[PDB]
Structure 1
Amino acid sequence: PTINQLVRKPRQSKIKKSDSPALNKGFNSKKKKFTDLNSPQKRGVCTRVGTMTPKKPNSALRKYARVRLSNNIEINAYIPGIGHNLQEHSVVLVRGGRVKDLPGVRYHIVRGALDTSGVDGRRQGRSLYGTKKPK
């Protein structure tokens, strides 16, 4: 563009989207509205718990939960690790990070937080699955 064209219409940068929109929103109950706040995790209640089939070429029964967050947004969260103790009405902590195999699963459920238990029999990378030191 000419300098005159830049002066008339300055350059405009591309806007960046969040990978975890459900964590960027809080809810004010008194005013019954949403509010913009960046959060690293959110509490939620597991509306459903079950398994999903990944997209090709992968094949598996990946464990996930449909969770209502404290801000009233309903999301799918993956359950990492081997074995979990989650059912409907379980209260779980949700963090960002999607599962590439699972199409609509954009969050993870923290292990070893609120109701969710650590992975039983985990000994390497235990902090990633909320397992205490066996000793």
Structure 2
Amino acid sequence: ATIAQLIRKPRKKKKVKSKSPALHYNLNLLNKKVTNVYSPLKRGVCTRVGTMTPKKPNSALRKYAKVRLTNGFEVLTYIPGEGHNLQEHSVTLLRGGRVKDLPGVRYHIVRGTLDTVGVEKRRQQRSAYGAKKPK
């Protein structure tokens, strides 16, 4: 614009928002305060399992779960696999992600690390799904 104008009101940079906000909130549980500490992957507990319908083009039944994390946020998370052992009450370990079909879902469940069982009957790209090597 003008040197004087920028001297008076400098350039303000646009803010940046995260894609997985619920993974960066930590609850102290003694003082009951929530602080912004970044964490890659976080443990939660599921409340309701079921299926959703993909948005416009896709047509299927995709497995979701309403999981409440170690903090006080409840998120809808897609279970990445064919078949699951979720029983409406279990402990899962969510990581970042974004399924395009289901709106509102912005997290995935790591398979075969904790209570949730791994994905057997898989020999290709198994290291992502948590499957023991056939050997």
TM over 0.5: yes
TM value normalised by structure 1: 0.97
Q: Distance in 2 between matches of 1:124 and 1:99?
A: 21
Write the distance in 2 (CA, Å) between the matches of 1:40 and 1:100: 21
Structure-1 residue corresponding to 2:80: 80
In the TM superposition, 1:87-98 aligns within 5 A as: 87-98=87-98
Rounded Cα–Cα distance in structure 2 between residues aligned with 1:111 and 1:91: 12
Measured in 1, the distance between the counterparts of 2:105 and 2:73 equals 14
Partner of 1:44: 44
Distance 2:88 2:63 in 1: 14
Distance in 2 separating the partners of 1:120 and 1:56: 31
Distance 1:56 1:6 in 2: 46
CA drift at 1:56 = 0.9
Match of 1:70 in 2: 70
User: What residue is the counterpart of 1:17 in the other structure?
Assistant: 17
Shift of 1:50: 1.1
Q: How many pairs align?
A: 135
Give the alignment's Cα RMSD to 1 decimal. Answer: 0.8
* Paired letter, 1:58: N
Divergent runs of 4+, >6 A: none
Paired AA for residue 50 in structure 1: G
Q: Which residue of structure 2 aligns with residue 59 of structure 1?
A: 59
SS of the residue corresponding to residue 106 of structure 2 reads strand
* Superposed CA offset, 1:7-52 (max 9, x none): 1111011101100000011111111121110000110000111111
The 8 Å contact of residues 50 and 64 in structure 1, kept in 2 or not, is answered as yes
Aligned amino acid, residue 117 of structure 1 = V
Identity of aligned residues (%): 73
Secondary structure at the counterpart of residue 49 of structure 2: strand
